Design a protein around this ligand. Structure first.
Ligand code: HEM
Ligand code: HEM
Ligand code: HEM
Ligand code: HEM
Lengths: 141, 146, 141, 146
């Protein structure tokens, strides 16, 4: 559950992403597949190779998704209903994999944005990603 | 843990450049800040109620190093982490009553910290490695419930 | 996230709970104490013997705490802010302990309401307890 | 694990009343329903989109019998659960990548199901003796990663 402050901290942080977000999308996803290779299982029809264009495009999609999410933090189940229906209804993704990717988004943000990566932002972003995570793994429609 | 020649070289090399005074401190705070219930186990430490207090706090910085050294000792004794932490595992899990879950959260708070610090150098290939080390320390610190 | 289906399933089960609330809450509190001895460290001032009016008084309390969240399935954060102050802010209970009591609550409901405890109602009740835990263990004030 | 004598009586005695034809499948079904991602590992079994469909699925019933058998075997070799379960642990972890957490959710659902079947006979004290048994088994099945 997000505090008013979490909501400040998240929007605030995310403005400070410039148009770089999608390059963080690709990298974290890469930290995932490389740090926890059981996660690839979900992408057997994909290019992985260091530098994949497919990974290039998928992270752009993932970041834009969290952009929309930061767009609507008081109503995330509504704002993400479709990704639920894909992740929870069709893909049936194990929520552990979401903790792994969240952690991997946390590790990437901390790579490129140290001066931004305050303990207070670290805690709010984690709660933002568990929330997003909770949403896409839940069957609620 | 299992590590390839190269990954083994990275885990150490990197670990060599670690600021021993900062990291475990920064880490424990990040653990306290992010997972607030972990503060129950550290009440005698004073005020933890706020971001700054967590990271202003001297005892937090102090205990933080106590954990850093235990990781380093572990980092030399990867071939025998169960033995290395056997006493320490009993302390947390017969006397301090901590859930083994947090052991896992803390390794991951550490990995972030290391990224936050080393930058491009903490490559996905290097992280790949640490996520294996940290899993182990956790597994290792948890084998007293058996 | 609670599905419209879930909300229906939940209310129906609690309609069937009736005035049998506090005994299940007590039994539950009992199942968790014997089943998970570490959760007793959360109660250094309680009497623990099978009798234990103190248990029953707390069982009755926990039950209506539950009953309350049922009538407010659409906003629990505002609804249980008070118990959040206790569990999240003051006691700082490790969320795992909610998973334990949660499970033990189902151990009981299943035990005394076999016919009511169908596979479908169990899902809804499990997600319900899970959402009760998140509120109680999140800090949002 | 380590049960006392009083607990060992209570465990064995209740387990002999179990309907070995009905209880494993009840479980995997409530497991499958209550936690839907667990359906990914069982796609072959057909339409698993609902509780009904999940409960009437013969492949689920047929599977349960085997799940419950793996459990029974546990209760005879309680202090050697590693040995007994390694072959299944190697199976689940390596060729299936079923995350540990899922082993614990099954044991728990198994406990609910026991409660459901036996009412008041499944007393708090019998719930404890069993909570010991399910952990252990789930720990042993985790044990290949470790
Ligand atoms: C932060 C959490 C996540 C977000 C925001 C997210 C977002 C997205 C988006 C935006 C798409 C494509 C949208 C579309 O094509 O309509 C997608 C697809 C997909 N996601 Fe995720 N995702 C998340 C977590 C995960 C996880 C943990 C996994 C499993 C490892 C996963 C597996 C997949 C797969 C297999 C696809 C389809 C890719 C394709 O075939 O095009 N996702 N996700
Ligand atoms: C998994 C990585 C961890 C490592 C390597 C580690 C290591 C240590 C060490 C070396 C000590 C010193 C004990 C002594 O020899 O006197 C200690 C104490 C302690 N640990 Fe941990 N620990 C870890 C995780 C945790 C977690 C997750 C918690 C709970 C949030 C925790 C709570 C404590 C507490 C409360 C103390 C005692 C502080 C005092 O003196 O009052 N530890 N730990
Ligand atoms: C289903 C989840 C839970 C609900 C609905 C719930 C509800 C309540 C209620 C109604 C009270 C009475 C407070 C008052 O009147 O001031 C209470 C207090 C308390 N709760 Fe919980 N609780 C839950 C879970 C837990 C868990 C898992 C623990 C830890 C093992 C816990 C620990 C406590 C403690 C230590 C108190 C204060 C008891 C006292 O000294 O009187 N609660 N809770
Ligand atoms: C409670 C611990 C568990 C026990 C005792 C158990 C038992 C078994 C047994 C006896 C088999 C048959 C293999 C053989 O011996 O020939 C099996 C296979 C299998 N297990 Fe489990 N299981 C457990 C947990 C899980 C969980 C949680 C999952 C995933 C959610 C899982 C996924 C599978 C799958 C997918 C198969 C083979 C599917 C197929 O027949 O093609 N198991 N397990």
């Amino acid at each position: 559950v997000l505090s008013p402050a979490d909501k400040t901290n998240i929007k605030t942080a995310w403005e400070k992403i410039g148009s770089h977000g999608g390059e963080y999308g690709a990298e974290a996803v890469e930290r995932m597949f490389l740090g926890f290779p059981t996660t690839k299982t979900y992408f057997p029809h994909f290019d992985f190779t260091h530098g994949s264009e497919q990974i290039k495009a998928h992270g752009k999609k993932v970041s834009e998704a969290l952009t929309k999410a930061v767009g609507h933090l008081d109503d995330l189940p509504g704002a993400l209903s479709a990704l639920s229906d894909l992740h929870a209804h069709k893909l049936r993704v194990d929520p552990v994999n979401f903790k792994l990717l969240s952690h991997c988004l946390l590790v990437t943000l901390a790579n490129h944005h140290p001066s931004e990566f305050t303990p207070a932002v670290h805690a709010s972003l984690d709660k933002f990603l568990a929330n997003v995570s909770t949403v896409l793994t839940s069957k609620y429609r | 843990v299992h590590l390839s020649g190269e990954e083994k070289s990275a885990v150490t090399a990197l670990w060599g450049k670690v600021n021993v005074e900062e990291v475990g401190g920064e880490t424990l705070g990040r653990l306290l800040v992010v997972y607030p219930w972990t503060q129950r186990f550290f009440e005698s430490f004073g005020d933890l109620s706020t971001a700054s207090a967590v990271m202003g706090n001297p005892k937090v910085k102090a205990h933080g190093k106590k954990v850093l050294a235990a990781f380093s000792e572990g980092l030399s004794h990867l071939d025998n982490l169960k033995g290395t932490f056997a006493k320490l595992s009993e302390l947390h899990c017969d006397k301090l009553h901590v859930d083994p879950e947090n052991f896992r959260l803390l390794g991951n708070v550490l990995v972030i910290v290391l990224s936050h610090h080393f930058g491009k150098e903490f490559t996905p290939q290097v992280q790949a490695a640490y996520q294996k080390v940290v899993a182990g320390v956790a597994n290792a610190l948890a084998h007293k419930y058996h």
